[PDB]
Amino acid sequence: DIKLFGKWSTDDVQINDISLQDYIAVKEKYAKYLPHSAGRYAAKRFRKAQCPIVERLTNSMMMHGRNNGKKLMTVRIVKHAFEIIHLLTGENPLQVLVNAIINSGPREDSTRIGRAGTVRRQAVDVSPLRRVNQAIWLLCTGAREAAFRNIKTIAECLADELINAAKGSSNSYAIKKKDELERVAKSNR
Amino acid sequence: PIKLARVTKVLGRTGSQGQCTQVRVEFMDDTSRSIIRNVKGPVREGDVLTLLESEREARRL
Amino acid sequence: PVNYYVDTAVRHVLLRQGVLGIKVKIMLPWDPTGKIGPKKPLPDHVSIVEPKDEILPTTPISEQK
Amino acid sequence: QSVQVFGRKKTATAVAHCKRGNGLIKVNGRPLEMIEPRTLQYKLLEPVLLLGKERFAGVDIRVRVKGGGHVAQIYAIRQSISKALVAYYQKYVDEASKKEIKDILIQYDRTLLVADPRRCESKKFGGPGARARYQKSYR
Amino acid sequence: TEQMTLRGTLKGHNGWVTQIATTPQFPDMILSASRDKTIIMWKLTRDETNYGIPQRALRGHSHFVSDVVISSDGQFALSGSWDGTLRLWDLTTGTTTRRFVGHTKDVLSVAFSSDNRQIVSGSRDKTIKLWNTLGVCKYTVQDESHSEWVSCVRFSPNSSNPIIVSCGWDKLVKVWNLANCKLKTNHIGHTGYLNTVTVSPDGSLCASGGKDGQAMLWDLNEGKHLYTLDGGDIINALCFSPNRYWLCAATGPSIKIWDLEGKIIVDELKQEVISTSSKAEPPQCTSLAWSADGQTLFAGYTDNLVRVWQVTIG
Amino acid sequence: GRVRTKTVKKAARVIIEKYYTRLGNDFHTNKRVCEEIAIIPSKKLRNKIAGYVTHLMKRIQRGPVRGISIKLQEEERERRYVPEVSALDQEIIEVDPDTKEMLKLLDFGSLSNLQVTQPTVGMNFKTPRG
RNA sequence: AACGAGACUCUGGCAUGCUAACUAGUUACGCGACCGGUCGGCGUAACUUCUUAGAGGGACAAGUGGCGU
Numbered sequence: 001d002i003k004l005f006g007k008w009s010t011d012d013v014q015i016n017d018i019s020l021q022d023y024i025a026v027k028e029k030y031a032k033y034l035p036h037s038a039g040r041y042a043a044k045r046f047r048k049a050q051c052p053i054v055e056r057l058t059n060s061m062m063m064h065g066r067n068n069g070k071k072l073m074t075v076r077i078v079k080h081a082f083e084i085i086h087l088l089t090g091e092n093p094l095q096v097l098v099n100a101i102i103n104s105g106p107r108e109d110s111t112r113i114g115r116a117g118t119v120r121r122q123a124v125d126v127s128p129l130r131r132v133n134q135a136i137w138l139l140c141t142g143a144r145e146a147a148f149r150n151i152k153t154i155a156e157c158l159a160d161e162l163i164n165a166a167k168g169s170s171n172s173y174a175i176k177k178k179d180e181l182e183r184v185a186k187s188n189r
Numbered sequence: 190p191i192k193l194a195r196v197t198k199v200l201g202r203t204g205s206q207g208q209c210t211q212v213r214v215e216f217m218d219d220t221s222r223s224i225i226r227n228v229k230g231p232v233r234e235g236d237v238l239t240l241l242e243s244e245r246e247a248r249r250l
Numbered sequence: 251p252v253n254y255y256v257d258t259a260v261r262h263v264l265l266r267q268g269v270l271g272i273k274v275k276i277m278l279p280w281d282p283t284g285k286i287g288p289k290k291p292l293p294d295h296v297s298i299v300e301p302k303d304e305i306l307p308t309t310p311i312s313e314q315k
Numbered sequence: 316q317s318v319q320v321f322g323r324k325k326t327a328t329a330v331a332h333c334k335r336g337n338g339l340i341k342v343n344g345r346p347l348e349m350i351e352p353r354t355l356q357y358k359l360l361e362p363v364l365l366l367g368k369e370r371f372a373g374v375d376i377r378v379r380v381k382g383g384g385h386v387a388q389i390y391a392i393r394q395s396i397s398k399a400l401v402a403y404y405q406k407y408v409d410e411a412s413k414k415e416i417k418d419i420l421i422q423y424d425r426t427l428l429v430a431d432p433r434r435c436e437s438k439k440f441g442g443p444g445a446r447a448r449y450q451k452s453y454r
Numbered sequence: 455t456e457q458m459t460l461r462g463t464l465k466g467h468n469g470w471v472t473q474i475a476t477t478p479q480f481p482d483m484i485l486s487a488s489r490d491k492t493i494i495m496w497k498l499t500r501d502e503t504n505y506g507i508p509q510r511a512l513r514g515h516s517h518f519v520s521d522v523v524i525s526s527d528g529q530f531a532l533s534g535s536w537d538g539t540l541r542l543w544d545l546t547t548g549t550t551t552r553r554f555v556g557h558t559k560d561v562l563s564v565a566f567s568s569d570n571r572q573i574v575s576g577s578r579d580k581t582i583k584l585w586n587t588l589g590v591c592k593y594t595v596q597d598e599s600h601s602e603w604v605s606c607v608r609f610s611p612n613s614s615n616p617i618i619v620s621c622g623w624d625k626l627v628k629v630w631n632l633a634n635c636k637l638k639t640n641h642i643g644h645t646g647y648l649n650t651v652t653v654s655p656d657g658s659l660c661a662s663g664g665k666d667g668q669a670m671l672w673d674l675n676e677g678k679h680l681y682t683l684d685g686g687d688i689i690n691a692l693c694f695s696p697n698r699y700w701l702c703a704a705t706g707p708s709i710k711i712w713d714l715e716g717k718i719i720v721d722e723l724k725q726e727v728i729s730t731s732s733k734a735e736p737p738q739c740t741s742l743a744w745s746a747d748g749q750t751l752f753a754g755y756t757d758n759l760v761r762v763w764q765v766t767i768g
Numbered sequence: 769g770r771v772r773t774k775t776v777k778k779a780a781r782v783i784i785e786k787y788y789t790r791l792g793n794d795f796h797t798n799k800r801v802c803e804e805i806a807i808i809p810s811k812k813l814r815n816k817i818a819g820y821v822t823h824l825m826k827r828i829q830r831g832p833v834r835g836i837s838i839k840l841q842e843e844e845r846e847r848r849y850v851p852e853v854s855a856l857d858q859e860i861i862e863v864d865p866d867t868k869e870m871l872k873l874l875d876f877g878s879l880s881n882l883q884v885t886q887p888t889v890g891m892n893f894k895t896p897r898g
Numbered sequence: 899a900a901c902g903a904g905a906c907u908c909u910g911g912c913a914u915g916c917u918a919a920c921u922a923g924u925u926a927c928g929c930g931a932c933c934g935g936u937c938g939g940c941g942u943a944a945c946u947u948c949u950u951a952g953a954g955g956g957a958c959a960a961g962u963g964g965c966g967u
Contacts, residue, residue, distance in 0.1 A: 005357075034355065034357045037358075046233060076354060108241050111229055114205075123242075127230025127232040127236065128238065130230025251906065290809070296775065296779040296807070296817070297806060298805060301786055309643065310642075312639065314677050318914095319924075319947050329948095332924080332947090344936065379924085381948090409509055410508040411508070430912090432912085433911085516956095517955065517956090537954085539915080553915090795960045799958080799960095810906070812905080815956095815957070819960060822958080822960065823960085
């Protein structure tokens with residue numbers, strides 16, 4: 001039925017976790033023709049889980065100062081990344097995106113106890129919505145400082161840090177910094 | 190031994206800067222083992238977590 | 251309501267050794283206009299009329315006129 | 316046979332006149348594929364890609380837009396067409412098909428039929444905008 | 455020996471229904487005012503999934519549609535609303551024709567005569583207004599009409615002298631004469647404010663229901679209290695049955711259908727299906743309409759829904 | 769929050785205590801009766817009062833409300849009850865032996881409706897202190 | 899009881915209900931131009947949806963379910 005960018009099917013994808021079951025977007029009714037729908041989801045608590053996750057990626061992709069309002073420059077980045085994913089892995093670019101979200105979010109964190117400047121942490125659980133938010137804040141971050149000055153264009157570098165993050169490879173920036181947050185999560189336990 | 194878990198009821202909110210929510214945690218293997226685990230993030234009733242360790246009780250910070 | 255229920259006046263008096271300044275305010279009354287005070291009431295003053303005792307009925311009176 | 320309704324985002328108001336016809340939908344004297352931001356072409360085509368050309372077969376709409384920006388003009392147009400077909404199918408066709416259109420329109424996106432009321436805040440002295448303040452020094 | 459079954463529900467509104475109008479001209483088209491600024495013209499498909507469909511909503515008002523009375527032919531309707539205007543429609547168009555200006559407060563009830571040339575309107579303005587069909591103020595009753603609001607005014611569908619009646623919130627049932635506008639009979643027998651008065655289809659028997667819940671019966675042409683029916687809570691509507699000769703008393707949660715002469719209840723019309731809402735109050739019966747055949751009773755509640763009835767002939 | 773100040777609640781309570789018959793459970797009807805009885809300025813105060821009147825008339829039907837008059841609040845309950853026989857019209861009145869000695873000094877030992885029960889035989893009526 | 903708070907005043911959001919509009923227009927009719935279509939192109943005509951600004955509605959924790967001496 002509804003195709004993202006008119007060319008990606010939305011029903012053949014399959015989530016794997018149940019911890020991120022409802023806090024990951026589109027399966028059957030969040031199928032939007034475009035990422036930018038311009039809804040108001042920051043109005044009350046627990047409403048950014050019910051916006052499309054491609055829109056979550058584009059919203060977290062305009063997160064530099066010189067690009068802090070440009071969204072029609074951002075939908076032509078997911079449109080210029082999902083085709084690169086569909087040519088590199090040969091299947092739906094939405095499924096690999098969900099697999100990159102699931103493997104990149106930390107599942108165990110530590111909070112600072114003590115005064116200002118010094119730390120003595122203690123390990124705590126991670127909420128599932130914060131696991132979703134921490135994933136896009138890492139996956140979106142990885143496609144900026146990589147593609148800063150290394151000539152290559154930024155639109156395919158988002159695919160470079162999404163496809164290598166779906167498999168759980170250690171060359172992707174997100175699961176690296178996830179496991180750097182996990183080694184310090186093992187340090188207290 | 191990666192264990193998966195439920196959420197019954199958040200108790201309060203603790204930590205130094207109030208960030209840590211205290212939630213009463215059920216297991217998804219249908220046992221009545223009601224562990225208390227501190228969680229960092231927005232959590233409501235009916236959530237499902239992935240506990241790496243599943244033996245430490247919650248304590249104040 | 252401070253715009254039409256009060257009226258302020260500032261006058262400087264000149265004495266021997268300096269200036270005194272006086273400030274006078276008056277909170278005007280009601281009377282929908284009697285050419286004194288505003289017509290508008292104070293906007294939190296609720297006034298409730300007293301009910302008049304209607305004659306209680308005992309029998310169904312079918313009174314033609 | 317005439318139905319005339321408007322749609323609104325922030326400052327853009329797009330009124331839309333709907334009469335019966337063949338299916339000529341031309342906003343501002345231009346067909347929908349020719350609006351220069353083509354990146355929201357699917358946002359523009361979300362009515363016809365949800366209701367089908369058979370509902371748009373006996374219609375004739377020329378949407379009249381002004382005000383706003385670009386994105387606010389696009390979001391004002393798609394509300395106007397969707398609000399025009401509802402009033403058309405209410406005034407001339409029975410209530411049932413109007414209900415079938417309206418229910419799937421609000422099930423897709425409520426913005427398509429009722430407007431977004433949020434509009435710009437005033438600037439306050441002491442800062443560059445509405446809430447942000449000028450940086451204050453100490454010592 | 456005859457029951458009242460839930461054949462269907464007329465679910466199309468958002469606000470509380472206030473009045474349903476029926477006609478002998480059409481046993482299929484049903485008009486029902488409501489509290490969502492919209493009168494919906496129904497079309498009774500009588501299907502097993504639904505007894506009726508919405509056909510043409512009369513979206514024209516700007517406040518609560520307080521009352522709807524229709525003409526002899528099934529093309530015209532007179533409607534009162536809380537904005538102070540009267541919207542005179544034309545049912546095949548879905549488009550108003552007139553608008554009657556001159557009521558400064560909430561128009562509570564209207565009524566339409568048989569000859570379609572006399573229009574009476576009772577409002578919170580404490581004024582009784584006689585209207586020509588064009589829009590002329592024929593008569594404003596400033597003849598000491600009522601000291602409070604007038605809840606319901608009604609014409610008399612009689613072969614005798616056409617008379618009007620005006621119950622008020624000052625517990626007075628006043629009778630006035632058409633084209634004379636003189637008070638004919640006062641009825642001081644009510645504790646609590648009056649709500650509805652309606653006339654038996656012979657044009658000689660009037661029932662008056664108030665806040666006490668006690669429907670008081672009155673004559674028109676001679677004017678005397680005949681019987682004293684009792685009910686439960688506040689009466690919201692009163693009708694008659696032209697075929698079965700019954701008193702259609704509308705209490706709050708249930709319709710107490712009463713006999714005019716035997717004063718025996720046929721059926722008690724109270725239906726509860728949920729147990730979660732046991733801490734709340736059940737919806738109150740405001741709209742009551744008796745069709746021309748009398749087989750179908752159209753009752754409407756405050757759950758934005760109208761419950762139709764069928765008489766199990768046994 | 770939405771906490772009604774004492775202007776709203778005071779005017780609502782005195783309208784309740786003066787006009788309990790005109791009021792009901794619908795908000796919009798009570799909105800109209802307060803604006804003709806009372807002289808209320810700008811519309812947001814008329815709406816806040818009439819909501820408290822609706823919320824207050826909801827609560828009087830369930831029992832007592834401490835803020836309004838007792839005489840009225842009790843009287844409405846009575847108006848909104850006669851048992852056929854009195855609760856003091858019993859046939860068997862169970863009395864103690866010591867009660868019948870008092871009636872014997874009251875020269876009322878000749879009553880027929882009495883039934884002298886035996887009292888309990890354990891002298892235990894205090895709480896086990898500690 | 900009173901001041902302060904609140905109320906109040908201005909502003910933002912809704913009205914195909916009302917009031918109107920050659921210094922605002924829509925729709926229609928002819929005319930003109932170029933391929934039944936495009937006109938911020940010309941003049942009459944119904945009327946206020948758009949556009950202006952007045953009057954008035956509208957929302958009150960009102961309805962429902964929990965938690966509440």
